[PDB]
Amino acid sequence: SISEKMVEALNRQINAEIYSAYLYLSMASYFDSIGLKGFSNWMRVQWQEELMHAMKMFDFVSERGGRVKLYAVEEPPSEWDSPLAAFEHVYEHEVNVTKRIHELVEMAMQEKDFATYNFLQWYVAEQVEEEASALDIVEKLRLIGEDAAALLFLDKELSLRQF
Amino acid sequence: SISEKMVEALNRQINAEIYSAYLYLSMASYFDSIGLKGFSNWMRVQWQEELMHAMKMFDFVSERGGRVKLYAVEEPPSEWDSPLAAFEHVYEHEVNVTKRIHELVEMAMQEKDFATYNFLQWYVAEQVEEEASALDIVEKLRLIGEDAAALLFLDKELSLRQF
Amino acid sequence: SISEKMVEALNRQINAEIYSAYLYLSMASYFDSIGLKGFSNWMRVQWQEELMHAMKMFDFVSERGGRVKLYAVEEPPSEWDSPLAAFEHVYEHEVNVTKRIHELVEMAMQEKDFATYNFLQWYVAEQVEEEASALDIVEKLRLIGEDAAALLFLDKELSLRQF
Amino acid sequence: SISEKMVEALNRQINAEIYSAYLYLSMASYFDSIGLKGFSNWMRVQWQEELMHAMKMFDFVSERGGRVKLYAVEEPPSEWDSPLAAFEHVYEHEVNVTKRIHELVEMAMQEKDFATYNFLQWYVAEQVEEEASALDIVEKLRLIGEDAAALLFLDKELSLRQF
Amino acid sequence: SISEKMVEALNRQINAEIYSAYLYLSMASYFDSIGLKGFSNWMRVQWQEELMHAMKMFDFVSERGGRVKLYAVEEPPSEWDSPLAAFEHVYEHEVNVTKRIHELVEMAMQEKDFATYNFLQWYVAEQVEEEASALDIVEKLRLIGEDAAALLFLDKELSLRQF
Amino acid sequence: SISEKMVEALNRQINAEIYSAYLYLSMASYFDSIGLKGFSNWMRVQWQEELMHAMKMFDFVSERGGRVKLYAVEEPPSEWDSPLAAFEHVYEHEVNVTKRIHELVEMAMQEKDFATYNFLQWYVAEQVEEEASALDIVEKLRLIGEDAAALLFLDKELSLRQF
Amino acid sequence: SISEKMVEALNRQINAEIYSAYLYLSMASYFDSIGLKGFSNWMRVQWQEELMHAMKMFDFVSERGGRVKLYAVEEPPSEWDSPLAAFEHVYEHEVNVTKRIHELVEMAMQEKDFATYNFLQWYVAEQVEEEASALDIVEKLRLIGEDAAALLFLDKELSLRQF
Question: A Pfam family in this protein (chains A, B, C, D, E, F, G) (predicted)?
Answer without folding.
Answer: Ferritin
